Design a protein around this ligand. Structure first.
Ligand SMILES: COc1ccccc1Oc1c(NS(=O)(=O)c2ccc(C(C)(C)C)cc2)nc(-c2ncccn2)nc1OCCC(=O)Nc1c(C)cccc1C
Ligand SMILES: CC(C)CCC[C@@H](C)[C@H]1CC[C@H]2[C@@H]3CC=C4C[C@@H](O)CC[C@]4(C)[C@H]3CC[C@]12C
Ligand SMILES: CCCCCCCC/C=C\CCCCCCCC(=O)OC[C@H](O)CO
Ligand SMILES: CCCCCCCC/C=C\CCCCCCCC(=O)OC[C@H](O)CO
Ligand SMILES: CCCCCCCC/C=C\CCCCCCCC(=O)OC[C@H](O)CO
Ligand SMILES: CCCCCCCC/C=C\CCCCCCCC(=O)OC[C@H](O)CO
Ligand SMILES: CCCCCCCC/C=C\CCCCCCCC(=O)OC[C@H](O)CO
Ligand SMILES: CCCCCCCC/C=C\CCCCCCCC(=O)OC[C@H](O)CO
Ligand SMILES: CCCCCCCC/C=C\CCCCCCCC(=O)OC[C@H](O)CO
Ligand SMILES: CCCCCCCC/C=C\CCCCCCCC(=O)OC[C@H](O)CO
Ligand SMILES: CCCCCCCC/C=C\CCCCCCCC(=O)OC[C@H](O)CO
Ligand SMILES: CCCCCCCC/C=C\CCCCCCCC(=O)OC[C@H](O)CO
Ligand SMILES: CCCCCCCC/C=C\CCCCCCCC(=O)OC[C@H](O)CO
Length: 430
């Protein structure tokens, strides 16, 4: 017997009824096949199961449970223009959904941490089967996500709304909560969702991804020099001593006037090539390539490559010079590519892609909720026009956030050739 009143929302809600229904059905089909296939693939590859990619199976299973339970209910609700179900279903759907993105949030954090740990060591000796502590991680992730979603199950209920004489059943977080905690949860829910399900995963994953790429860069520079010196051995002690020589070499470069401008201007990979040269000829010898240094300062890669090729250094040690100059030219590790550098590159790509896909899928909806919280005043005279914009962004945000439930298998297919090959075997060859 409770009502609402305006103008702008009406046609947007009706217009988006078909958009929301189509996106949900798309997510349902793409998500059901992609995540089932992903689970199938991950557990079968015993070298995958050995390590961090078992957390990706946790991702896929959590999204699968949301897809099979919550999305059909939402489709029925959209078409019915009412909540046709009972109170139990009203409590179940938001509980399942909140638990599922919690599993996604914590799995992505765990994946970025475990990838960082793997990079930090030399001569990694893997065990057989799922590592015991990764299994503990999975249980903990799922238990915490479920406990955090419990308030949805407690708070949601069915109420009847009267809209201009028409009665509608609506499933929502009940306006009156019984306990003081549940009343606090209702007031704080919107900020809490932004904090735990958006800010926390971005903070954890950005930090550990950054640590991981920094250690990958040091190991790649270490292998670059060892390969160019005819061979050598890695390990924590060997790397630490080498890193001190690198740090000292960069300290020298920053105190020499010819080298600092080109060094500061260069990217990380191209700085390694310049450090490589400093290791071979010393600091003053590198300063001699004024024309070449100028070209690298002005980003003339091909031009700089030719000038370096025409040098005494090139004549004496051509094989090393060719590799160094390719590094300058491409800004990649392709000339020094071995299995270690190959595996480091694939690892960085998959973690980066999954986190970025999560962030972009969810950012519009979180931005919706925030703008509505801070800005929407119904007491402001032009109340209905601002609502129209927020309602449209909220609808877009809902569909884009929903896409993340099916996006990870597709992203893995597109980014990792290992996963792409495994996808083809399971689907195209079945
Ligand atoms: C961490 O979680 C969030 C963080 C920040 C903001 C929102 C967050 O989560 C939500 C979200 N949360 S909610 O507002 O508490 C809510 C949940 C369920 C329900 C019914 C349907 C049971 C009555 C009504 C309201 N609501 C919707 C929503 N979608 C459609 C209509 C009404 N509401 N979408 C979200 O994410 C979109 C992705 C998604 O998967 N949504 C979804 C889908 C696609 C189907 C079913 C249920 C849901 C929540
Ligand atoms: C694998 C992918 C491409 C399949 C896509 C399935 C989508 C497009 C299908 C599945 C269910 C379908 C909906 C089911 C019922 C209705 C209600 C009707 O009043 C309008 C059409 C509408 C809204 C359909 C639109 C198309 C639809 C959403
Ligand atoms: C890449 C994935 C391929 C698969 C895609 C499957 C086919 C979807 C095609 C059309 C559905 C479009 C539905 C969304 C449009 C809703 C119509 C609408 O809102 O119309 C309002 C009207 O203009 C007010 O008068
Ligand atoms: C794999 C993990 C997934 C976990 C999924 C849990 C599913 C069961 C829970 C709620 C469904 C409710 C069904 C709605 C029908 C209600 C009928 C009824 O009245 O009885 C049940 C109620 O608990 C007493 O009345
Ligand atoms: C991704 C899907 C999540 C994984 C599967 C989910 C876990 C299912 C196991 C136990 C249910 C949770 C047990 C605690 C939740 C029940 C609490 C509750 O329902 O409260 C009733 C409320 O008080 C009435 O008003
Ligand atoms: C792997 C390890 C698995 C560990 C598994 C942990 C499961 C959840 C534990 C604590 C969360 C519960 C904390 C909240 C307690 C609520 C107390 C309560 O229910 O209060 C009654 C209420 O006051 C009457 O109306
Ligand atoms: C294959 C599926 C895998 C699914 C794996 C999921 C693991 C969930 C395990 C324990 C969570 C139990 C949560 C218990 C929450 C206790 C607090 C509570 O229930 O509060 C109700 C409130 O008191 C009413 O008024
Ligand atoms: C800052 C807002 C935090 C929001 C997340 C809450 C954490 C969920 C923990 C226990 C469930 C409480 C169940 C007990 C309810 C009894 C009434
Ligand atoms: C690595 C360090 C991470 C540390 C672990 C962080 C995990 C949770 C994240 C944010 C906490 C939630 C903050 C949100 C506060 C609840 C909502 C609120 O602000 O309630 C007050 C209300 O606005 C009055 O009107
Ligand atoms: C120097 C050490 C600091 C290192 C930091 C790393 C930890 C960051 C992790 C989570 C932060 C999440 C913060 C979420 C902020 C939103 C909370 C908020 O805005 O409060 C609501 C509103 O203001 C009330 O009315
Ligand atoms: C592309 C199809 C878009 C469909 C509709 C929008 C859906 C929005 C969700 C995700 C899009 C963003 C995903 C971006 C992933 C980038 C991965 C990447 O950049 O590769 C890593 C490498 O290190 C450098 O390329
Ligand atoms: C996953 C991506 C989700 C898909 C997102 C696609 C972008 C939707 C933008 C505008 C459509 C709705 C705009 C409605 C603005 C006009 C509302 C109105 O009242 O117009 C009535 C007339 O029939 C028509 O304009
Ligand atoms: C229909 C479902 C919409 C969501 C789909 C998921 C988003 C996929 C987008 C980018 C993946 C990364 C592409 C990176 C390609 C870089 C080139 C490469 O092969 O590495």
């Amino acid at each position: 017997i409770s009502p609402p009143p305006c103008q702008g929302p009406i046609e947007i809600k009706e217009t988006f009824k078909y958009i929301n229904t189509v996106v949900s059905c798309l997510v349902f089909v793409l998500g059901i096949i992609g995540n089932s296939t992903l689970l199938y693939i991950i557990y079968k590859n015993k070298c995958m199961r050995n390590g961090p990619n078992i957390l990706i199976a946790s991702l896929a299973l959590g999204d699968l449970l949301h897809i099979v339970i919550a999305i059909p209910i939402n489709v029925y609700k959209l078409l019915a223009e009412d909540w046709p179900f009972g109170a139990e279903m009203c409590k179940l759907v938001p509980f399942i959904q909140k638990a599922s993105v919690g599993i996604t949030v914590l799995s992505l954090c765990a994946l970025s941490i475990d990838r960082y740990r793997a990079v930090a060591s030399w001569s990694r000796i893997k065990g057989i089967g799922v590592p015991k502590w990764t299994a503990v991680e999975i249980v903990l992730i799922w238990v915490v996500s479920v406990v955090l979603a419990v308030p949805e199950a407690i708070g949601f209920d069915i109420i009847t709304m009267d809209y201009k004489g028409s009665y509608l059943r609506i499933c929502l977080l009940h306006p009156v909560q019984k306990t003081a905690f549940m009343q606090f949860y209702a007031t704080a829910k919107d900020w809490w969702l932004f904090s735990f399900y958006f800010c926390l995963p971005l903070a954890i994953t950005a930090f550990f991804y950054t640590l991981m790429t920094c250690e990958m860069l040091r190991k790649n520079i270490f292998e670059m020099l060892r390969i160019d010196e005819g061979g050598g051995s890695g390990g924590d002690e060997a790397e630490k001593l080498f890193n001190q020589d690198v740090d000292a070499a960069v300290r020298g470069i920053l105190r020499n006037a010819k080298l600092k401008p080109v060094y500061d201007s260069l990217d990380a990979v191209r700085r390694a090539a310049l450090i490589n040269m400093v290791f071979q000829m010393g600091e003053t010898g590198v300063a001699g390539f004024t024309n070449s240094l100028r070209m690298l300062q002005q980003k003339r890669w091909d031009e700089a490559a030719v000038n370096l090729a025409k040098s005494r250094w090139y004549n004496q040690t051509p094989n090393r010079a060719k590799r160094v100059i390719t590094t300058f030219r491409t800004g990649t590790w392709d000339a020094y590519l071995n299995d270690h550098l190959k595996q480091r590159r694939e690892v960085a790509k998959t973690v980066f892609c999954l986190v970025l896909v999560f962030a972009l899928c969810w950012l519009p909806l979180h931005l919706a909720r925030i703008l509505k919280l801070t800005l929407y005043n119904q007491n402001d005279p032009n109340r209905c026009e601002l609502l129209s914009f927020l309602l449209v962004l909220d609808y877009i945000g809902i569909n884009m956030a929903s896409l993340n439930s099916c996006a990870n298998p597709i992203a893995l297919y597109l980014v990792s050739k290992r996963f792409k090959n495994a996808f083809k075997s399971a689907l195209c060859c079945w």
